[PDB]
Design a protein around this ligand. Structure first.
Ligand SMILES: [Mg+2]
Ligand SMILES: [Zn+2]
Ligand SMILES: [Zn+2]
Ligand SMILES: [Zn+2]
Lengths: 66, 51, 113, 185, 436, 49, 204, 133, 263, 97
RNA sequence: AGCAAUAGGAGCUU
């Protein structure tokens, strides 16, 4: 839905890295290198960011009913 | 409506919306109305022509 | 709907003691201690501290059920020594070791700057 | 000594590649689909909309039902169309097929994983499982909490379950690109 | 509802009297029911979705009836096959096999924890098997601590000597293990084992407490030892792969020779059996023996540290066929007793040619699960698994009908005080029960 | 309704395994332990409790 | 929120329920401090022969280390050996084993543990949707027996096979008590002459 | 204070089946036909072929609840390198002068042949074995 | 006798070698830093107007998972030991979040930096959500479209990681010892040779490999422990380590107190 | 010798056959030829064969009881409604089945 | 101090 604040397995804060990860992906860097620069070294933390699907963009498209 | 017996049941079912793949599978399901009155295991078998 | 509260691990009730001592009558000079609201962190530390004393003949612990936050410890000592005094001795020794460890860590951290 | 043509409604059918089988040209025995067709599909138009139906109408893919399937010889992969000259203790031994001197293939599978359905397509490496476990997963994957629709907030149903933090799988099948499992995990 | 109340506990279907047994209550959070793991066999239960029913007796007569007739300790031995039905299972078995190996030694602190973990320990620390240069206990000593005293058991496995080079057989003297790995043959549900002996000598209560003692000791040891299984435990080295593939190729050549003999009309038929049925029987024999030989090669290749081998040797899960199918060869699939039929016209699949009787065409899977099945082998294995699922789904109704009719036929039959076996009409069925 | 019937004072839920229970012990959820009941006649040995 | 008794499965027929939950510090850890979300039992692989489960764990570990998604399409030319080569090139034991430590003691485990990511599913069967108890409640109008249904606060059926098991046990009083005092017990008056329930009774 | 003193020459050592345990065979150097088979911990007392072992069997170490030994006390085991405790589970007063004794050292097994006049006093409940070199 | 040798030391993580201590001590320290070091986290959320697409308890969970500066949290009291009714100023920190999207194009992101500390036991340096830098935008909390609004009053309280993971000051405490398996505490699975098939520990070069002529030692215990503490910014690495030590000290002092005052 | 089909009386008479040991797997034939006790023996043999085929072992007394109920009246009583409900027991038992 | 029935369909564990 939206990027989780913590890593499930260990608890590192990944919620402040989703925008940086997307910016890294625009200039062409592949996912492993972007995850390296954000200093996600354990594969638990890495799969936290690498497997996120951002569904809030899809949910926000339906007009607010208030 | 007055001939509910001798009519096929379960031809229409409530669309399964539990998850997306369940919906996609329910929309592609098939039913042979042989019925359970009868222990012929032959029509229940995966067959070569099913490939 | 049957899940107990996550704070009963550490909040001691008023009717529940922290510690309760009963003697093991089968062998001489042995006692059974139940620690309520503790877990492996204190148990293993105390057990491996006490296991290295000459006057301690038996020391062990268990957590009978993981869904309940306590452990029970059996401790036997030789004739002259009392298991309680050895327990205070082990606690004091670990406290002193931790104080020395803290002092050395702080000095090292200052030097690293 | 019969010739049966069917135009009935309700027959189940599946597409196959068409191996060139006319025994008169150097193009005999290999797939009629080439790299120009894939270039056209990626482009989206022919070089004087190019989609699936253009392949079907150009004679490189056709549909076959169960009855027509009786008369054809389907190659499993595009490599099976030619006998190789190996010895890999890790990769699985593609069957010897030594009894027959010369194979005359008429069709090729587009991809063998397409024999599976929607629910079985989620399974990773289903060819490493005993079949009852694949069946149990085909049943159980329909009971898995996810995001059934993106407009679940303007719908009013008797029951609905939405996972807080859906994640796409680290091990994924090609079919899930078409099943949207990575878009709505 | 309070602790130690007897309640009747039950899982459907209730096929025999030990599917519904009376248990003592212990109140717990976390809305599931909790069961000791050795009673899951009489219930035929596992923990992947199952639900079980609990019935509360509402009077003292029913409390006493439950506790004195239906209690779990009283049902350990069954009259169906005069053997125990509750055993040591599913991790305690593997752990006790690993713990009672000859080269398993334990230091003093872990020994102390294991002794304190035993509910029936008498507070006496056993002497270590080794006193110098370092006190070491063997796993056999710690397991013998669990067994009650006054128990003697002796078993011979393939004529082993009293010095047991293989650590096979079993000797128990006054409750102490002298030699022998402790595995399914000692703590399983088979007759004559340790559970049966303790049940017969000490009673149901001590035999019930034996399960708990062994479970606790072995579970602690395995918690601090560890046990796993990985993709590497199903992989055989290159030389064994060469042996396995050579055996499979030899069997394929043998089958091709049988096919040649059948096609040029020189095969020797068998009584009451057709030439085509003789050909099929000989081919099935050949392929079954091929799979068995490849499996034997794979089993001999496995080290003693192989986790699949440890589980199989303990007898707690899996067998030789499982090892064979994972590492060497899945083998031949059968649908309705025969090989894979020609569902298409003269062939099994439309990727084969007409009248092809080779093993691959008619349902022989040459690969292992580790190596991966081909699409054809995958489809044939799917047909076989579907046949199995249909059988399981369909025969249970006939079986339930048969058992209901048997129960109604025999429901009114009781042994009377004069020894006779009579029905409700008073008619004699047997003059003495069981003739003994 | 005669060979078999529905009964009061019964419960049902998923089962779990517990290595730390005795063989003849069953772990009962608190909610079920409070929903179900046993009638205990008052006597001069159990009146305080 | 997931709790004890909720049903979970991986994509290879490996279903199971949560038996217990452990906190971060209680779970076994690798030398890098990674701890598992989930610990399944080794005894589910051998007799079930779900090799794809282990292969998919290995592939997922490699994919998460190298930052892409592993391709697990069936009937491809991928092998366990290639995956193990990648994993070893990434500095990990090639078979997915890791040296892990006991959470309770920090001591190394004598055996190595198969460790890595796996895609699990949250199935609709929750214990809180199934747990039901009934002391006394509504009965049916016609039969005056406990109603049917968890939602209706019904009772459990003590069917014929339960009666067979109680008969085998020889518990006659318990059977009478299940079928009478735990169900539709009634009182009727019969005629001592005609034996019919045609007796008009005015108890007051 | 010992029951059976002797010196043995190790003949074969099959490490083989296990990793911390090896079975050894040895005939007495002074009195042949006395055979000794013994399981020993490799990591605590490694033994090679043709080595010479002084082997003692004793009913006690003095000169019921096990407690770790202090440095200050003394026992018979002070003069040896490898001490094990075991249970006699078979005493075979068999053929003419073949006498076999079986001792189980917590699952590590021992057999000892020889004439009756050597092993007559080896008919006990529990036996210590002590080894040098 | 215990010794510390710091190998790397920055604000978020410290990598140190611990020596001349028992393994139980080192593991108790690891466990204490993971589970029993108090921090500050939002434990009570009050929704005034939430017209965003996200649900109320979704947002509440995310807000509870936000790291807050907890340097002075030890001079604070647990909300269960204060005489006060509904939160006072000395056992709680009150935060406000107000966000709103005006216009009919674009999306307004609501970040953790938008949380504003209103009250709290001053002048204690607690309560603020942790920012990595001066230019940090913080954690993503929600997204807002036209006329959608979020009005929230969060309360922050003192707690430990036993009750809930949001109070954990640490992410991952790497921990190992004996890189060369001299003690034989593990027993390596292998196919051909256990030395070729197993990668070296990252502290392998910190200890001498065993010599081929060497025999096994049955006197050696574990004596050197290499551990790498990481934090979430709520506490600093030296602060996490020192307060874990102090928490362990006070747990032992509590045991000693109960023992002495049980006479 | 093993055969297909059944004619017990005539094969028992043929010279060269051990007339005291010929056996049939159809115990109705045994009853018509050899009597009811031999029928009980044959019935037990068949039931033991069916159970012990796969290595299962059922204690003797259970199968003995089953064959004694089936041969108690002098003739073979099948486990069916046609057998159970032709007894002289009470009406409520028979109706309950 | 009182919460319908009958059907069909889809599922759970054997
Ligand atoms: Mg089940
Ligand atoms: Zn992480
Ligand atoms: Zn009348
Ligand atoms: Zn306050």
């Amino acid at each position: 839905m939206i990027i989780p604040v913590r890593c499930f397995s260990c608890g590192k804060v990944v919620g402040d890295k989703w925008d940086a990860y997307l910016r890294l992906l625009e200039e062409g860097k592949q996912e492993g290198d972007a995850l390296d620069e954000l200093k996600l070294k354990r594969y638990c933390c890495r799969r936290m960011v690498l497997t996120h699907v951002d569904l809030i963009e899809k949910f926000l498209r339906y007009n607010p009913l208030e | 409506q007055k001939k509910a017996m001798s009519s096929r049941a379960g031809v229409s079912q409530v669309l399964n919306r539990y998850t997306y793949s369940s919906t996609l599978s329910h929309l592609r399901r098939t039913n042979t109305p042989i019925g359970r009155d009868g222990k012929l295991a032959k029509p229940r078998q995966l067959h070569n022509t099913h490939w | 709907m049957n899940a107990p509260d996550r704070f009963e691990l550490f909040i001691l009730p008023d009717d529940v003691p922290k510690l309760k001592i009963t003697p093991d009558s089968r062998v001489p000079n042995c006692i059974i201690i139940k620690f309520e609201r503790e877990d492996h962190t204190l148990a293993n530390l105390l057990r491996e501290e006490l296991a290295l004393y000459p006057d301690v003949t038996f020391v062990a612990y268990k957590v009978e059920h993981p869904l309940f936050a306590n452990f029970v410890m059996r401790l036997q000592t030789e004739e002259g020594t009392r298991p309680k005094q050895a327990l205070e001795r082990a606690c004091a020794s670990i406290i002193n070791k931790l104080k020395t460890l803290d002092h050395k860590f702080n000095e090292e951290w200052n030097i690293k700057n | 000594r019969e010739f049966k043509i069917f135009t009935d409604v309700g027959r189940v059918y599946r597409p196959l590649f068409i191996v060139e089988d006319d025994e008169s040209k150097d193009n005999k025995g290999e797939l009629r689909i080439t790299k120009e067709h894939i270039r056209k599909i990626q482009q989206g138009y022919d070089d004087d909309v190019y989609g699936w139906s253009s392949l079907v109408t150009s004679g490189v893919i056709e549909y076959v039902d169960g009855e027509e399937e009786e008369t054809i010889m389907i190659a499993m992969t595009p490599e099976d169309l030619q006998t190789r000259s190996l010895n890999d203790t890790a990769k699985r031994i593609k069957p010897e097929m030594s009894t027959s001197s010369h194979h005359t293939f008429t069709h090729c599978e587009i991809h063998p994983s397409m024999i599976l359905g929607v629910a079985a397509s989620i399974i990773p490496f289903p060819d490493h499982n005993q079949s009852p476990r694949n069946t149990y997963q085909s049943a159980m994957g329909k009971q898995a909490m996810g995001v059934f629709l993106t407009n679940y907030n303007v719908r009013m149903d008797t029951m609905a379950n939405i996972l807080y933090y859906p994640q796409k799988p680290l091990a994924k099948t090609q079919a899930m690109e078409y099943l949207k499992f990575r878009e709505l995990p | 509802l309070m602790d130690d109340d007897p309640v009747l506990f039950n899982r459907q279907p209730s096929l025999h009297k030990m599917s519904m047994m009376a248990h003592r209550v212990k109140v717990m959070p976390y809305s599931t029911f909790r069961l000791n793991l050795s009673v899951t066999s009489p219930y035929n239960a596992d923990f992947d979705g199952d639900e079980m029913n609990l019935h509360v007796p509402q009077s003292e007569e029913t409390r006493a009836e439950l506790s004195q007739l239906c209690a779990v300790p009283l049902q350990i031995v069954s009259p169906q096959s005069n053997k125990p039905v509750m055993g040591i299972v599913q991790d305690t078995l593997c752990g006790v096999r690993k713990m009672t190996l000859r080269d398993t030694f334990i230091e003093y602190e872990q020994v102390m924890n294991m002794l304190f973990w035993v509910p029936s320990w008498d507070g006496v620390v056993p002497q270590p098997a080794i006193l110098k240069p370092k006190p070491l206990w063997t796993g056999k000593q710690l397991l013998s601590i669990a067994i009650p005293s006054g128990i003697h058991l002796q078993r011979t496995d393939g004529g082993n000597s009293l010095l047991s080079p293989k650590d096979n057989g079993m000797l128990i003297v006054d409750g102490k293990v002298m030699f022998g790995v402790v595995d399914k043959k000692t703590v399983g549900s088979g007759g004559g084992g340790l559970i049966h002996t303790v049940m017969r000598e000490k009673g149901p209560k001590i035999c019930a407490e034996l399960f708990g003692n062994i479970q606790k000791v072995v579970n602690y040891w395995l918690l601090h030892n560890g046990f796993s299984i990985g993709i590497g435990d199903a992989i055989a080295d290159a030389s064994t792969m060469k042996e396995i593939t050579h055996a499979i190729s030899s069997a394929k050549e043998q089958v091709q020779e049988i096919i040649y003999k059948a096609q040029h009309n020189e095969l020797e038929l068998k009584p009451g059996m057709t030439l085509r049925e003789s050909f099929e029987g000989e081919v099935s024999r050949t392929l079954n023996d091929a799979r068995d030989s490849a499996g034997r090669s794979a089993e001999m290749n496995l080290k003693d540290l192989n986790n699949v081998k440890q589980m199989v040797s303990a007898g707690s899960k899996g067998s030789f066929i499982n090892i064979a199918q994972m590492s060497a060869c899945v083998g031949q699939q059968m649908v309705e007793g025969k090989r894979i039929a020609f569902g298409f016209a003269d062939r099994s699949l439309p990727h084969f040619t007409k009248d092809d009787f080779s093993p691959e065409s008619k349902g022989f899977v040459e690969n292992s699960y580790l190596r991966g099945l081909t699409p054809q082998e995958f489809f044939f294995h799917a047909m076989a698994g579907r046949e199995g699922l249909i059988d399981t789904a369909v025969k249970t109704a006939e079986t339930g009908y048969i058992q209901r009719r048997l129960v109604k036929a025999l429901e009114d039959i009781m042994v009377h005080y004069d020894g006779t076996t009579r029905n409700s009409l008073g008619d004699i069925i047997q003059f003495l029960y069981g003739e003994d | 309704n005669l060979m078999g019937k529905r009964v009061d004072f019964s419960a049902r839920t998923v089962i779990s395994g517990d290595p730390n229970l005795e063989l003849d012990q069953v772990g009962v959820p608190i909610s079920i332990a409070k929903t179900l009941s046993y009638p205990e006649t008052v006597t001069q040995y159990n009146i305080h409790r | 929120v997931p709790q004890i008794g909720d049903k979970f499965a991986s994509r290879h027929g490996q279903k199971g329920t949560i038996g217990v939950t452990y906190r971060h510090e209680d779970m076994p850890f690798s030398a890098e401090g990674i701890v598992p979300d989930l610990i399944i039992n080794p005894h589910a692989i051998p007799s079930r022969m779900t090799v794809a489960h282990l292969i998919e764990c290995l592939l997922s570990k490699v994919g998460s280390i190298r930052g892409y998604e592993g391709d697990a399409t069936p009937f491809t030319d991928l092998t366990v050996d290639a995956v193990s080569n990648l994993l070893r090139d990434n500095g990990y034991q090639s078979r997915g084993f890791e040296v892990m430590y006991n959470g309770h003691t920090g001591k190394k485990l004598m055996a190595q543990v198969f460790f890595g990511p796996t895609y699990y599913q949250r199935l609709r069967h929750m214990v809180d949707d199934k747990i039901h108890a009934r002391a006394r409640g509504p009965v049916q109008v016609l039969t005056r027996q406990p109603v049917e249904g968890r939602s209706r606060d019904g009772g459990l059926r003590f069917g014929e096979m339960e009666r067979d098991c109680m008969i085998a046990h020889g518990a006659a009083g318990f059977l009478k008590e299940r079928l009478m005092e735990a169900s539709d017990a009634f009182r009727v008056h019969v005629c001592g002459i005609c034996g019919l329930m045609s007796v008009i009774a005015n108890l007051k | 204070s010992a029951l059976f003193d002797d010196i043995f020459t190790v003949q074969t050592v099959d490490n083989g089946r296990y990793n911390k345990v090896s079975r050894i065979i040895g005939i007495s150097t002074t009195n042949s036909a006395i055979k000794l088979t013994l399981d020993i911990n490799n990591e605590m007392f490694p033994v090679s072929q043709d080595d010479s072992l002084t082997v003692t069997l004793a009913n006690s170490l003095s000169l019921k609840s096990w407690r770790p030994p202090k440095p200050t006390d003394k026992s018979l085991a002070d003069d040896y390198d490898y001490v094990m405790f075991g249970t006699v589970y078979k005493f075979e007063e068999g053929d003419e002068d073949k006498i076999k004794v079986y001792v189980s050292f917590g699952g590590l097994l021992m057999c000892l042949e020889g004439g009756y006049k050597s092993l007559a006093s080896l008919k006990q409940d529990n036996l210590y074995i002590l080894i040098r070199r | 006798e215990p010794k510390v040798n710091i190998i790397n030391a920055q604000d978020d993580e410290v990598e140190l070698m611990l020596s001349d201590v028992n393994l139980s001590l080192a593991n108790s320290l690891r466990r204490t830093m993971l589970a029993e070091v108090p921090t500050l986290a939002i434990d009570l959320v009050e929704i005034k107007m939430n017209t965003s697409v996200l649900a109320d308890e979704f947002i509440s969970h995310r807000l509870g998972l936000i790291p807050l500066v907890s340097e002075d949290v030890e001079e604070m009291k647990y909300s269960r030991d204060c005489t006060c009714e509904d939160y006072c100023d000395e056992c709680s920190v009150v935060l406000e979040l107000s966000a709103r999207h005006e216009g009919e194009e674009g999306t307004t992101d609501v970040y953790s930096s938008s949380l504003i500390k209103v009250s709290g036991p001053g002048n204690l340096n607690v309560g603020e959500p942790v920012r990595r830098d001066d230019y940090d935008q913080g954690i993503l909390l929600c997204k807002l479209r036209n006329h959608q609004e979020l009005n929230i009053r969060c309360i922050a309280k003192k707690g430990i990681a036993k009750e809930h993971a949001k109070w954990s000051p640490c992410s991952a405490i790497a921990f190992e010892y004996d890189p060369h398996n001299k003690l034989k505490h593990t027993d390596f699975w292998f196919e051909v040779d256990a030395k070729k098939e197993w990668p070296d520990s990252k502290y392998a070069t910190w200890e001498e490999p065993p010599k081929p002529g060497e025999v096994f030692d049955y006197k050696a215990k574990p004596n050197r422990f290499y551990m790498t503490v990481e934090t979430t910014g709520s506490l600093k690495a030296n602060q996490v380590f020192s307060r874990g030590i102090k928490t362990l000290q006070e747990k032992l002092a509590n045991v000693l107190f109960e023992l002495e005052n049980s006479r | 010798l093993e055969t297909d089909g059944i004619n017990l009386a005539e094969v028992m008479a043929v010279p060269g056959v051990d007339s005291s040991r010929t056996y049939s797997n159809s115990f109705v034939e045994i009853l018509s030829v050899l009597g009811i006790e031999a029928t009980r023996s044959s019935l037990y043999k068949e039931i033991l064969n069916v159970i012990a085929f796969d290595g299962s072992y059922v204690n003797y007394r259970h199968m003995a009881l089953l064959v004694d109920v089936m041969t108690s009246r002098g003739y073979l009583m099948a486990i069916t409604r046609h057998g159970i409900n032709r007894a002289d027991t009470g009406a409520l038992m028979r109706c309950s089945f």
